[PDB]
Symmetry: C2
Subunit: 271 residues, 2 copies
């Protein structure tokens, strides 16, 4: 009886009716299932030139691919890219015409993390190869990705550190090209409707179960599958943090970051 949705628990018609009746004015609207063309992007760096292999990556890619596909997203997976190539790929994704007939997107980045951003494949101390988190939000913003204006953009980042001070986030501050937008694109908020969810916790290896996925990605998939039907995604992220509250060996506490969501994002699995 299971199908496109896999192991994601379905929101019944009754359930969906209730959520929408109660808060429709502040729920991101979703598009008709039959005609919508949802897109997602996973970029996973596993094999690196000068830094450790990320054993566990393939289980994560497979799990997140399955998850997002079960939630209705056409998932485009890219592997072992330089920051330069990650940039080129981001811009292409941002420019896909399918987003015009979509209601939302997910972007997943799985790689090594340092203070300054996400490590590309050719990264070393001498020769840097870093994707700045900021560039993700910029390339998907209102001006650079007008097809996703007013639509939620969920950015999941697994950027495990090791000895370094995780991923830094947060600051507090040439002229661009005139592309002659209608004054309603011009006057829109540059950045709006983003939510990020970030883990920089290193992996604990089990040699008995090598190849196995990161606990973060596993815990996220588990919670998405169980609670996509009843909770909006902000709340699902909070519940992942709740699940990690009593520490085991390796303490995990992923942070929700750069929230410019204006409405609740419900996934309405089954619809």
């Amino acid at each position: 009886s299971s199908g496109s949705e896999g192991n994601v628990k379905l929101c019944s018609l009754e359930e969906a009716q209730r959520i929408w009746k109660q808060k429709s004015a502040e729920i991101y609207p979703i598009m008709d299932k039959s005609s919508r063309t949802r897109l997602a992007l996973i970029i996973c760096n596993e094999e690196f030139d000068s830094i450790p292999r990320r054993t566990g990556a393939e289980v994560d890619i497979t799990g997140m691919t399955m998850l997002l596909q079960n939630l209705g997203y056409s998932v485009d997976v890219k592997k072992n890219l330089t920051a330069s190539d990650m940039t080129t790929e981001l811009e292409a994704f941002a420019h896909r015409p399918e987003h015009k007939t979509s209601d939302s997107t997910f972007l997943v980045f799985m790689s090594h993390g340092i203070r300054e951003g996400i490590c590309g494949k050719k990264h070393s101390e001498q020769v840097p190869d870093i994707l700045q988190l900021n560039a993700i939000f910029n390339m998907l913003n209102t001006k650079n990705c007008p097809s996703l204006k007013d639509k939620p953009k969920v950015i999941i980042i697994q950027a495990a550190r090791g000895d370094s001070p995780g991923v830094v986030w947060f600051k507090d501050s040439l002229p661009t090209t005139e592309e002659f937008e209608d004054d309603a694109i011009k006057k829109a908020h540059i950045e709006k409707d983003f939510i990020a969810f970030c883990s920089s916790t290193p992996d604990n290896v089990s040699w008995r179960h090598p190849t196995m996925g990161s606990v973060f990605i596993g815990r996220l998939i588990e919670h998405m599958q169980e609670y996509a039907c009843s909770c909006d995604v902000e709340e699902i992220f909070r519940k992942v943090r709740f699940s990690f509250e009593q520490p085991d060996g390796r303490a995990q506490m992923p942070t929700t970051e750069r929230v410019t969501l204006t409405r609740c994002f419900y996934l309405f699995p089954g619809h």
Copy 2:
């Protein structure tokens, strides 16, 4: 009464919430015995950089709000980074927190890339309090009295001819202070939520010293919605209220959320 402008949560409303989600709501303390503390730090008068007009209306608005929500408010004004740090460290050590369920910290100043401007700041010899330092001073190691309790941080840190007050990043030996092993095994940073506005100062001229729109909008939403919405959502709704821009676009961000539960203020209780 003591709540004034804040709409009160009712016993039926308040029991509604609690029954629905008590296992995932931050518990609040008995009203008669809790001693809630909040801190406002505002730099408005500066040596070298522009005077921030309308600060006093914001201070007064935020103080009243926090008092209405059940917090005793200490306000500190025009401090160097060094003095702000001293004050924050003092705030963290107050015994009241031992008998409290939560806190709010408010920072209002000029902001740059590196963090919040202090009174003596110039681009020639900076004076900046790092946002990181705020979280560190209130974290589990350094402020054990607020472990497992919500710590709301509001930063109004207006941008100059500058790209912003940026956050984030992913990833010298400290003094050994002999913490209990339960403190050592605890999550170092948990139960925080920041709401940040980095919008520049436009100034009213026929009628000056009239508050900032961010703070006004936050206060209005807290008054309206504390009786039915957790702070997270209240912060969402302020964003919702700014969706169609006025002249000066404002979209304040929620940042560094390690909240594991929902923080209902339950005004009136």
